[PDB]
Design an enzyme around this catalytic site. Structure first.
Site, short mmCIF file in Angstrom:
data_model
loop_
_atom_site.label_atom_id
_atom_site.label_comp_id
_atom_site.label_asym_id
_atom_site.label_seq_id
_atom_site.Cartn_x
_atom_site.Cartn_y
_atom_site.Cartn_z
N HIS A 1 13.60 12.82 13.97
CA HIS A 1 12.36 12.87 14.77
C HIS A 1 11.54 11.61 14.61
N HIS A 2 12.02 10.76 13.72
CA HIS A 2 11.43 9.48 13.42
C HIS A 2 12.11 8.40 14.26
N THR B 1 5.70 27.29 6.65
CA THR B 1 4.44 26.66 6.21
C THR B 1 3.28 27.58 6.55
N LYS C 1 2.64 30.36 4.07
CA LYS C 1 1.96 29.86 2.88
C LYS C 1 0.46 29.75 3.11
N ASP D 1 10.16 22.28 -25.26
CA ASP D 1 10.12 20.97 -24.62
C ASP D 1 11.07 21.03 -23.46
N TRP E 1 6.97 -0.14 5.07
CA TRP E 1 7.58 0.60 3.96
C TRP E 1 9.00 1.04 4.26
N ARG F 1 0.60 0.44 15.59
CA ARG F 1 0.57 0.36 14.13
C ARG F 1 1.02 -1.02 13.70
N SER G 1 -1.57 26.98 -5.09
CA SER G 1 -1.34 28.42 -5.32
C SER G 1 -1.99 28.81 -6.65
N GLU H 1 11.62 13.15 1.52
CA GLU H 1 10.63 12.47 0.70
C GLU H 1 9.20 12.93 0.91
N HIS I 1 12.60 11.78 5.27
CA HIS I 1 11.85 13.01 5.53
C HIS I 1 11.74 13.87 4.27
N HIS J 1 0.85 -1.18 0.00
CA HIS J 1 0.00 0.00 0.00
C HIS J 1 0.89 1.24 0.00
N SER K 1 14.98 6.53 -11.85
CA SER K 1 13.96 7.24 -12.63
C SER K 1 13.78 8.65 -12.10
N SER K 2 13.54 8.80 -10.80
CA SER K 2 13.34 10.14 -10.22
C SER K 2 14.53 11.12 -10.19
N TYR L 1 8.30 15.93 1.78
CA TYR L 1 8.15 17.28 1.31
C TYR L 1 8.18 17.25 -0.21
C1 HEA Z 1 3.17 15.12 2.71
C2 HEA Z 1 3.25 14.51 3.88
C3 HEA Z 1 3.70 15.01 5.21
C4 HEA Z 1 3.93 16.30 5.59
C5 HEA Z 1 3.86 17.57 4.78
C6 HEA Z 1 4.41 16.20 6.97
C7 HEA Z 1 4.66 17.28 7.78
C8 HEA Z 1 5.06 17.23 9.10
N1 HEA Z 1 5.24 16.07 9.84
FE1 HEA Z 1 5.07 14.19 9.21
N2 HEA Z 1 4.76 12.37 8.64
C9 HEA Z 1 4.32 11.94 7.43
C10 HEA Z 1 3.87 12.78 6.41
C11 HEA Z 1 4.01 14.15 6.35
N3 HEA Z 1 4.48 14.88 7.41
C12 HEA Z 1 4.51 10.47 7.26
C13 HEA Z 1 4.35 9.61 5.98
C14 HEA Z 1 4.91 10.04 8.48
C15 HEA Z 1 5.11 8.62 8.93
C16 HEA Z 1 6.20 7.81 8.29
C17 HEA Z 1 6.43 6.53 9.01
O1 HEA Z 1 7.10 6.56 10.07
O2 HEA Z 1 5.92 5.50 8.52
C18 HEA Z 1 5.09 11.20 9.33
C19 HEA Z 1 5.64 11.13 10.63
C20 HEA Z 1 5.97 12.21 11.44
C21 HEA Z 1 6.67 12.18 12.73
C22 HEA Z 1 7.09 10.97 13.59
C23 HEA Z 1 5.97 10.13 14.23
C24 HEA Z 1 6.47 8.86 14.91
O3 HEA Z 1 6.77 8.94 16.13
O4 HEA Z 1 6.54 7.79 14.25
C25 HEA Z 1 6.83 13.44 13.06
C26 HEA Z 1 7.42 13.91 14.20
O5 HEA Z 1 8.11 14.91 14.19
C27 HEA Z 1 6.18 14.27 12.07
C28 HEA Z 1 6.05 15.68 12.10
C29 HEA Z 1 5.66 16.52 11.06
C30 HEA Z 1 5.78 17.96 11.09
C31 HEA Z 1 6.32 18.80 12.21
C32 HEA Z 1 5.35 18.41 9.88
C33 HEA Z 1 5.18 19.84 9.44
O6 HEA Z 1 5.52 19.99 8.05
C34 HEA Z 1 3.79 20.44 9.62
C35 HEA Z 1 3.68 21.90 9.19
C36 HEA Z 1 2.25 22.39 9.11
C37 HEA Z 1 1.73 23.20 10.03
C38 HEA Z 1 2.49 23.47 11.29
C39 HEA Z 1 0.38 23.80 9.87
C40 HEA Z 1 0.34 25.05 9.02
C41 HEA Z 1 1.05 26.24 9.68
C42 HEA Z 1 0.43 27.16 10.46
C43 HEA Z 1 -1.05 27.34 10.46
C44 HEA Z 1 1.28 28.10 11.31
C45 HEA Z 1 0.86 28.28 12.77
C46 HEA Z 1 0.97 26.98 13.54
C47 HEA Z 1 1.75 26.75 14.61
C48 HEA Z 1 2.45 27.89 15.29
C49 HEA Z 1 1.96 25.32 15.12
N4 HEA Z 1 5.73 13.52 11.03
C1 HEA Z 2 0.05 8.74 -0.97
C2 HEA Z 2 -0.04 8.27 0.29
C3 HEA Z 2 -1.14 7.39 0.83
C4 HEA Z 2 -2.47 7.56 0.65
C5 HEA Z 2 -3.08 8.57 -0.30
C6 HEA Z 2 -3.17 6.62 1.54
C7 HEA Z 2 -4.50 6.33 1.51
C8 HEA Z 2 -5.08 5.34 2.28
N1 HEA Z 2 -4.40 4.61 3.30
FE1 HEA Z 2 -2.55 4.62 3.81
N2 HEA Z 2 -0.63 4.51 4.20
C9 HEA Z 2 0.39 5.12 3.51
C10 HEA Z 2 0.22 5.91 2.37
C11 HEA Z 2 -1.00 6.33 1.82
N3 HEA Z 2 -2.25 5.89 2.31
C12 HEA Z 2 1.69 4.85 4.12
C13 HEA Z 2 3.02 5.48 3.77
C14 HEA Z 2 1.49 4.01 5.17
C15 HEA Z 2 2.58 3.42 6.08
C16 HEA Z 2 2.81 1.92 5.85
C17 HEA Z 2 3.63 1.27 6.95
O1 HEA Z 2 3.17 1.32 8.11
O2 HEA Z 2 4.71 0.70 6.64
C18 HEA Z 2 0.04 3.82 5.25
C19 HEA Z 2 -0.60 3.06 6.22
C20 HEA Z 2 -1.97 2.89 6.26
C21 HEA Z 2 -2.68 2.34 7.34
C22 HEA Z 2 -2.09 1.77 8.64
C23 HEA Z 2 -1.91 0.24 8.66
C24 HEA Z 2 -1.16 -0.20 9.89
O3 HEA Z 2 -0.16 0.48 10.23
O4 HEA Z 2 -1.58 -1.20 10.52
C25 HEA Z 2 -4.00 2.35 6.98
C26 HEA Z 2 -5.05 1.82 7.72
O5 HEA Z 2 -6.12 2.34 7.72
C27 HEA Z 2 -4.10 2.95 5.70
C28 HEA Z 2 -5.26 3.19 5.04
C29 HEA Z 2 -5.40 3.99 3.96
C30 HEA Z 2 -6.67 4.31 3.42
C31 HEA Z 2 -7.95 3.86 4.06
C32 HEA Z 2 -6.53 5.11 2.36
C33 HEA Z 2 -7.63 5.75 1.65
O6 HEA Z 2 -7.78 7.14 2.01
C34 HEA Z 2 -7.48 5.70 0.15
C35 HEA Z 2 -8.46 6.59 -0.57
C36 HEA Z 2 -8.16 6.45 -2.04
C37 HEA Z 2 -7.48 7.42 -2.68
C38 HEA Z 2 -7.35 8.79 -2.11
C39 HEA Z 2 -6.78 7.20 -3.99
C40 HEA Z 2 -7.64 7.88 -5.01
C41 HEA Z 2 -6.68 8.70 -5.80
C42 HEA Z 2 -6.31 8.25 -7.00
C43 HEA Z 2 -6.57 6.84 -7.33
C44 HEA Z 2 -5.66 9.07 -8.11
C45 HEA Z 2 -6.50 8.93 -9.37
C46 HEA Z 2 -5.75 9.51 -10.55
C47 HEA Z 2 -6.11 10.57 -11.29
C48 HEA Z 2 -7.25 11.46 -10.87
C49 HEA Z 2 -5.38 10.94 -12.56
N4 HEA Z 2 -2.87 3.37 5.27
CU LIG Z 3 9.70 13.38 9.12
#
Ligand code: HEA
Ligand code: HEA
Ligand SMILES: [Cu+2]
Ligand SMILES: [Cu+2]
Ligand SMILES: [Cu+2]
Ligand SMILES: [Mg+2]
Ligand SMILES: [Zn+2]
Lengths: 261, 514, 56, 98, 84, 43, 47, 75, 227, 84
Positions: free
Chosen positions: B290-291, B316, B319, B91, B126, B438, B255, B242, B240, B61, B156-157, B244
């Site tokens: 932080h992970h 953030t 924005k 292009d 993952w 989890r 935007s 990744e 991480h 997934h 590729s990327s 962003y």
């Molecule tokens: C696109 C996806 C995405 C984005 C953008 C972010 C953004 C952030 N994530 Fe992440 N995060 C994930 C996807 C993402 N994350 C994933 C996939 C994992 C789990 C991976 C795994 O372990 O499997 C994860 C896990 C994860 C962890 C670890 C959890 C653990 O213990 O396993 C942490 C901890 O620091 C964290 C923090 C944050 C923070 C601080 C931001 C910041 O970027 C947030 C910034 C946004 C705001 C803050 C809100 C907007 C701003 C304002 C309105 C300003 C005013 C607000 C304040 C003054 C607070 N994330």
């Molecule tokens: C892109 C990131 C992504 C997205 C979008 C989602 C979407 C979904 N994921 Fe998630 N999920 C992950 C990335 C993602 N997930 C990752 C990184 C983990 C961590 C794995 C790990 O623990 O190792 C995770 C783990 C995870 C868990 C935790 C399992 C566990 O730890 O035991 C669960 C359980 O509910 C879950 C559920 C779902 C569900 C219900 C959706 C639903 O919201 C899905 C809804 C469907 C969609 C939003 C897709 C539709 C969009 C398209 C098909 C695009 C179509 C194309 C065009 C329009 C051109 N996901």
């Molecule tokens: Cu992180």
């Protein structure tokens, strides 16, 4: 429209990307066969189609630039950027390996004897051949520069002479390094020291071979008058890659061969 | 002919279309996998079986949605389609290489599919952390295939990252400065740089993992003096950036969408917006640990990483507030895309706010490895990254195709998906605060209510992605051709009509040097 | 030595409506087909191996 | 040192490369490598937009530090004006094209 | 350990060709001699079955699956002990 | 954003068909496999 | 370039017959959604 | 003696070395008091500590290593 | 442990867990403030026919919205860091227990004096006696003295595992070849449940933790009858 | 510990002015705060007449010839011991 009025290059449809993508599939899955079901036929085919692709893809690039004249100034500036960027991704690739090394050597686990180099490992002497390999690489740095300068000054014979000297030093290092491997009193399997050593110096080794075939290609392109005193990116790149290679060796030397041993 | 066009391409538009097609299909696979996950957790007990078959599903997934749906669509699809059009380029810099980037994807996907077929697949998560990913606890070709799939996807990327940076820097009109290119272009130019620097470290990490299990090395094996934690550092150093890399192109599309439907010429605070992404991209490189809060690191360093992670909220924030400021005096048009843009703005805020909570190591001790973190990232991914993809898709579909979508249907689709995702992920905040770990195929009886509600929401989402497929069909079945487009003065992509011709900007664009 | 880039420039600039990877003759063509053949076959062979390994 | 033997662009450059090489020395720029310098832009002194057809996209950076370029097709005919600031632009046939 | 030396302000190919044969190559010769003089053949290290060495968690993909790639029997023992 | 009327309009019946089909193609295969889960879990 | 241009022509699949299209979209997205189900089945039927 | 007390030279979450150091220390002291007699004095403190902190399996394997002479630490 | 339909954290059995509840409340109060502020501004923006599509001056307001978030972050950071150090604090434990994660069970070792060591396995839902918790009961509870500072040392003998007990606010990964330390200190008697907090294979969900805290007296008699 | 970031290919004064106020200065502000927060006043170190410290082989060319230049009585003892 119809006739373009921008200085860019619209490349003709090529089957090579598909061919090289398929190649990657074959080599990766082929390694999986070798590693698991003990077979190389697949790995062999992949290495084959891969060379075929690179040969052709680069042959065309030469055709399009030297024979067809598509490499206008704007197109060239873009190639420079591409190379720089590529070398960068490479610099970060090697960084994973120095991270690994330093991680291990700075905090040696008890299973090693709680020291570095781990008990039982007999490190090579940096002052022996490693010192030689260092001077060889460094000299090819000065000779490739001489080559570059002759080329810009239109000195055909000298550019050829310097490019030749450079190439042999690169080969000399390859052989020398090859023997070191064979005489080394430790192996990839000798814990983290061997891992850390053989894969870092090993990947670098692969890079010296990749850089040498590149300079060789440059050599022949010159024998065939491909390069002009002013347009020779193929050489500029070969040269940049070659320096990246000395530099990586300098870090290897100082870190693994000297400090971590 | 078809071959030459579709297999031997050198056209940014066609390669971009090829991506969107790959991403949509991969999106189906990932959706199916997410449903098996909630199917298994929707009733106390075991449906599939042991955490192996279950975790194999959870792993695929993640890989599928991250590497095969989100990245291909946003960067390869919209990236290739729109970038050249927005800067007036004929292009890309390397048309051929660009094609290899695409064709490396299907094979990469095959290797991943193959991994779950041979043996018992890869039930590693993952993050494919060792010792579980090692040749003892996970003997066989599976993990190796998972690794090779990742190698290709990475090659590729970074090849594409090289193309976008070169194009974007080197192929704009001579009079146009970088501070004159649109936010989306900036968004992908910055994402491209993150890929160039993070992807190689991952490849260094998994190559070390590959040798550890086939060549008798011990990089992560204590026996030889290795360290399972070393893999965590390498992985997360890429891990991480990744995420962003996953939200930035989304920031850009947002935007563009918010500005367009607000009837504005440009977004509020353009240079603040450029500064924000650049800061986000940079801080994103110094916070990986932080992970690893519960791994046993020094209190001091644990303190550094919680602080460093928190300052990302500032940029953030500028924005979020800028997009709001953009809506300000606007003449709002309640189009489907605007609906997706608004949802993103809120939902992404909530999900990132929830991430600031996890930023705290102390609190993260009890929050780590629980469903709270599953909620955090699904908010920012399912209703952040994905909402941007949908808004961008419905907004630019006419440009790509020449045909229009049925707006009412398109709005129905938002309504359904908005309900679905919230119902799915909202409860999960509780399950996590209350302790549900989890990667479990089953849970103690207490967690039954929320897990039930949660699974029901996932079925509504299923309904929505089914309807979307139809919505695309109908658009193509009816054939309402585009006539007029608004605000083209400030939106170059539309100036060549829908769809733009195979060859655009054959004769450049005229831009004065004031 | 030689220096006949001038002959090749002409050969490759010739308006025969051929793509650069074929503009050079018959060998270009055989090389192409060999490469294409090995790739497709290999790909077929690989799929067979995977189908084979999928089973216990 | 001493000697010679390597070709020069002037003598070995071909295709489009050569074309821009020569064109550049005559002071002209047929492949738009340089940034066109603005005129006063008045109705009487319009910016002359060369073109190889009968319409070309003009991008107007109204004010120096502007982050937004105003885009529009300039057609063959009477001078036209940037929608945001007047500024006249007039199409003109593109001479050198080889 | 040096600092630097003889400046020749104008660098063209003649200067680099001068450095190549007047510095670069002579060094490669000296070090070659040095390494040819310090060619002391170390007697194969004493074997002791340390567990952190001669690691084997999966037989190598070649030979008898117990022989490392550039295996030198003279200086590399098998896990069991020296080859022969 | 304006557009010409559909060159080949899709009447409600036509939509109802395409919608039904689209659903079945997703729901059937999964339903079948899911319907027989136990048989698999018991060989 | 003999590459046709315009709506319905810049895609690798035919959009001329809405029902042939219906079939194609159905197999395309359909086969994608079914794959995980059949993989799980395959894994459940091994020993 | 209750249990091994806080050790300033090992102030963080990772105690691996704490266990390791005392195991060495003890056996190093032991060997000396043996090869010196000095009324066969004994370094019990180190053994109390290392026994408390070191998981059984480590101590066991180390002892075996010391038996066959494949113990990597210098005693 | 966790009860049906629970929303927040499990009740704090130890003082740092209490300290955390309060910090979370603080942090959560703020996320409610910001998340509701944003929602209000959004609805505000979308609710007027009045327009102003010309150019708007940024920067000016840009400071307010950059300095404010900066102050708020300190308001969270300070409390957070204090608790952080408070956890890694200089304390002197009166007991040291070791736990070793294994593929699908934990084993404990009390070895300060005598070599006491046992295995803790989950009770199959089939052999649970009425009133016993489905996936949480273990056969051998880890008995420890209430009201005392214990030092836990977590490690593993195979893959990674994570030893956690939410009520006490503890979670420490178990990494082979490593000895991670943590301070346990319950301020009340009882049974306290936890689960493996790290993916470790097929039975990852079926290898729980159950702490049973009784007074010293009963602790030592238990310890002896255990060998 | 970083790697790098947002490329903006064209660097003129606007770019450097951008880095100055968008990176350089903000860092000086953060670190300033950091150093303003970690402003923990260490209690003057315990005095012990070590011979390798408070060296005096020739009285300083100023004052009573026993006081170092930037002498801080709070944290700097004389050879004899702390000032007062
Ligand atoms: C696109 C996806 C995405 C984005 C953008 C972010 C953004 C952030 N994530 Fe992440 N995060 C994930 C996807 C993402 N994350 C994933 C996939 C994992 C789990 C991976 C795994 O372990 O499997 C994860 C896990 C994860 C962890 C670890 C959890 C653990 O213990 O396993 C942490 C901890 O620091 C964290 C923090 C944050 C923070 C601080 C931001 C910041 O970027 C947030 C910034 C946004 C705001 C803050 C809100 C907007 C701003 C304002 C309105 C300003 C005013 C607000 C304040 C003054 C607070 N994330
Ligand atoms: C892109 C990131 C992504 C997205 C979008 C989602 C979407 C979904 N994921 Fe998630 N999920 C992950 C990335 C993602 N997930 C990752 C990184 C983990 C961590 C794995 C790990 O623990 O190792 C995770 C783990 C995870 C868990 C935790 C399992 C566990 O730890 O035991 C669960 C359980 O509910 C879950 C559920 C779902 C569900 C219900 C959706 C639903 O919201 C899905 C809804 C469907 C969609 C939003 C897709 C539709 C969009 C398209 C098909 C695009 C179509 C194309 C065009 C329009 C051109 N996901
Ligand atoms: Cu992180
Ligand atoms: Cu476990
Ligand atoms: Cu587990
Ligand atoms: Mg974890
Ligand atoms: Zn203007």
């Amino acid at each position: 429209m119809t006739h373009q009025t921008h200085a860019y290059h619209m490349v003709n449809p090529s089957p090579w990307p598909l061919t090289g993508a398929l190649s990657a599939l074959l080599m990766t899955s082929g390694l999986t066969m070798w590693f698991h079901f003990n077979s190389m036929t697949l790995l062999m085919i992949g290495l084959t189609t891969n060379m075929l692709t690179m040969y052709q893809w680069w042959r065309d690039v030469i055709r399009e630039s030297t024979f067809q004249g598509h490499h206008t100034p704007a197109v060239q500036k873009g190639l420079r950027y591409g190379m720089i960027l590529f070398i960068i991704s490479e610099v970060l690739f090697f960084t994973g390996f120095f991270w690994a090394f330093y991680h291990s050597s700075l905090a040696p686990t008890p299973e090693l004897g709680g020291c570095w180099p781990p008990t039982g490992i007999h490190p090579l002497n940096p002052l022996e051949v490693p010192l030689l390999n260092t001077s060889v690489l460094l000299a090819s740095g000065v000779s490739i520069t001489w080559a570059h300068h002759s080329l810009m000054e239109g000195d055909r014979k000298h550019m050829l002479q310097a490019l030749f000297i450079t190439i042999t030093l690169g080969v000399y290092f390859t052989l020398l390094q090859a023997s070191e491997y064979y005489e080394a009193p430790f192996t990839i399997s000798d814990g983290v020291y061997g891992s850390t050593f053989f894969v870092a110096t090993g990947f670098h080794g692969l890079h010296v071979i990749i850089g040498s075939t590149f300079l060789i290609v440059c050599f022949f392109r010159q024998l065939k008058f491909h390069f002009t005193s002013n347009h020779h990116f193929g050489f500029e790149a070969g040269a940049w890659y070659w320096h990246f290679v000395d530099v990586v060796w300098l870090f290897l030397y100082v870190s693994i061969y000297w400090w971590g041993s | 002919m078809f071959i030459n066009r579709w297999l031997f391409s050198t056209n940014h538009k066609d390669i971009g279309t090829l991506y969107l097609l790959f991403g949509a299909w991969a999106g189906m696979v990932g959706t199916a996998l997410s449903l098996l996950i909630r199917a298994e957790l929707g009733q106390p007990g075991t449906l599939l079986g042991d955490d192996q078959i279950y975790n194999v599903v959870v792993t695929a997934h993640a890989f599928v949605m991250i590497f095969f749906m989100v990245m291909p669509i946003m960067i390869g699809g919209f990236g290739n389609w729109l970038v050249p059009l927005m800067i007036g380029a004929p292009d890309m810099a390397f048309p051929r290489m660009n094609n290899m980037s695409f064709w490396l994807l299907p094979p990469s996907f095959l290797l991943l599919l193959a991994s779950s077929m041979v043996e018992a697949g890869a039930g590693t998560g993952w993050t494919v952390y060792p010792p579980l990913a090692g040749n003892l606890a996970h003997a066989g070709a599976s993990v190796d295939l998972t690794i090779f799939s990742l190698h290709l996807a990475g090659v590729s990327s970074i090849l594409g990252a090289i193309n976008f940076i070169t194009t974007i820097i080197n192929m704009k009109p001579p009079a146009m400065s970088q501070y004159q290119t649109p936010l989306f272009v900036w968004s992908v130019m910055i994402t491209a740089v993150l890929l160039l620097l993070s992807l190689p470290v991952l490849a260094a990490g998994i190559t070390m993992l590959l040798t550890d299990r086939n060549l008798n090395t011990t990089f992560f094996d204590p026996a030889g003096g290795g360290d399972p934690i070393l893999y965590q550092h390498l992985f997360w150093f890429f891990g991480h950036p990744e995420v962003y890399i996953l939200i930035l192109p989304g920031f850009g599309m947002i935007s563009h969408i918010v500005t367009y439907y607000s009837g504005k010429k440009e977004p509020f605070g353009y240079m603040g917006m450029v500064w924000a992404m650049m800061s986000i991209g940079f801080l994103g490189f110094i916070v990986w640990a932080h992970h690893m809060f519960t791994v046993g690191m020094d209190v001091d360093t644990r303190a550094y990483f919680t602080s460093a992670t928190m300052i990302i909220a500032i940029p953030t924030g500028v924005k979020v507030f800028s997009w709001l400021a953009t809506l300000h005096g606007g003449n709002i048009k309640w189009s489907p895309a605007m609906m997706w843009a608004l949802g993103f703005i809120f939902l992404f805020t909530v999900g990132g706010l929830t991430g600031i909570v996890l930023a705290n190591s102390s609190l993260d001790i009890v929050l780590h490895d629980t469903y709270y973190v599953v909620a955090h990232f699904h908010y920012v991914l399912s209703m952040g990254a994905v909402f941007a993809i949908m808004g961008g898709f419905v907004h630019w579909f006419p440009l790509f195709s020449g045909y229009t979508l049925n707006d009412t249907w398109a709005k129905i689709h938002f309504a359904i998906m908005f309900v679905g995702v919230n119902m799915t992920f909202f409860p999960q905040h509780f399950l996590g605060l209350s302790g549900m770990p989890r990667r479990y195929s089953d849970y103690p009886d207490a967690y039954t209510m929320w897990n039930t509600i949660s699974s029901m929401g996932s079925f509504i989402s299923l309904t929505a992605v089914m309807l979307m497929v139809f919505i695309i069909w109908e658009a193509f079945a009816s054939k309402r051709e585009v006539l007029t487009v608004d605000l083209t003065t400030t939106n170059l992509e539309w100036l060549n009509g829908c769809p733009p011709p195979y060859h655009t900007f054959e004769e450049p664009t005229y831009v004065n040097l004031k | 030595f030689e220096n006949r880039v001038a002959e090749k420039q002409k050969l490759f600039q010739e308006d025969n409506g051929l793509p650069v990877h074929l503009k050079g003759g018959a060998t270009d063509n055989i090389l192409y087909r060999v490469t294409m053949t090995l790739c497709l076959g290999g790909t077929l062979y690989s799929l067979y191996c995977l189908g084979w390994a999928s089973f216990p | 040192a001493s000697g010679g033997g390597v070709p020069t662009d002037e003598e070995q450059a071909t295709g489009l490369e050569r074309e821009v090489m020569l064109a550049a020395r005559k002071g002209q720029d047929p492949y738009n490598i340089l940034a066109p310098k603005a005129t006063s832009g008045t109705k009487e002194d319009p910016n002359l937009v060369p073109s190889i057809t009968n319409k070309r996209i003009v991008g107007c950076i109204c004010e120096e530090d502007n982050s937004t370029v105003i885009w529009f097709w300039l057609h063959k005919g009477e001078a036209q004006r940037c929608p945001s600031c007047g500024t006249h632009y007039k199409l003109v046939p593109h001479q050198l094209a080889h | 350990a040096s600092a630097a030396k003889g400046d020749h302000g104008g660098t063209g190919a003649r200067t680099w060709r001068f450095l190549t044969f007047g510095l670069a190559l002579p060094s490669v010769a000296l070090c070659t001699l040095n390494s040819w003089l310090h060619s002391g053949h170390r007697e194969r290290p004493a074997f002791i079955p340390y567990h952190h060495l001669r690691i084997r968690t999966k037989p190598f993909s070649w030979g008898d699956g117990n022989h490392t790639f550039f295996h030198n029997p003279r200086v590399n023992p098998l896990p069991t002990g020296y080859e022969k | 954003i304006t557009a010409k009327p559909a060159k080949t309009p899709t009447s409600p019946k036509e939509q109802a068909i395409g919608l039904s089909v689209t659903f079945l193609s997703f729901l059937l295969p999964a339903g079948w496999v899911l319907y027989h889960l136990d048989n698999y879990k018991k060989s | 370039s003999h590459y046709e241009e315009g709506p319905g022509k810049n895609i690798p699949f035919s959009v001329e017959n809405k029902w042939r299209l219906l079939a194609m979209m159905t197999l395309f997205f359909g086969s994608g959604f079914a794959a995980p189900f059949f993989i799980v089945r395959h894994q459940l039927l091994k020993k | 003696y209750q249990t091994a007390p806080f050790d300033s030279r090992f102030p963080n979450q990772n105690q691996t070395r704490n266990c390791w150091q005392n195991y060495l220390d003890f056996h190093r002291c032991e060997k000396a008091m043996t090869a010196k007699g000095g009324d066969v004095s004994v370094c019990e403190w180190y053994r109390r500590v290392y026994k408390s902190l070191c998981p059984i399996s480590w101590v066991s394997t180390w002892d075996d290593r010391r038996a066959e002479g494949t113990f990597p630490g210098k005693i | 442990m966790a009860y049906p339909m629970q929303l927040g954290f499990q009740d704090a059995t130890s003082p740092i867990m209490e300290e955390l509840l309060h910090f979370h409340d603080h942090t959560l109060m703020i996320v409610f403030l910001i998340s509701s502020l944003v929602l209000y501004i959004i609805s505000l923006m979308l609710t007027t026919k009045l327009t102003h599509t010309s150019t708007m001056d940024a920067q000016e307001v840009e400071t307010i919205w950059t300095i404010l978030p900066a102050i708020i972050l300190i308001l969270i950071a300070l409390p957070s860091l204090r608790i952080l150090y408070m956890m890694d604090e200089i304390n002197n434990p009166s007991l040291t227990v070791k736990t070793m994660g294994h593929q699908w069970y934990w084993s404990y070792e009390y070895t300060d004096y005598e070599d006491l060591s046992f295995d803790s396995y989950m009770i199959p839902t089939s052999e649970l006696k009425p009133g016993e918790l489905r996936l949480l009961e273990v056969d051998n509870r880890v008995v420890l003295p209430m009201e005392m500072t214990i030092r836990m040392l977590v490690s593993s003998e195979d893959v990674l595992h994570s030893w956690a007990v939410p009520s006490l606010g503890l979670k420490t990964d178990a990494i082979p070849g490593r000895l991670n330390q943590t301070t346990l200190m319950s301020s009340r008697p009882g049974l306290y449940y936890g689960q493996c907090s790290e993916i470790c294979g097929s039975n990852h969900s079926f290898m729980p933790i159950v702490l049973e805290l009784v007074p010293l007296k009963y602790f030592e008699k238990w310890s002896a009858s255990m060998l």
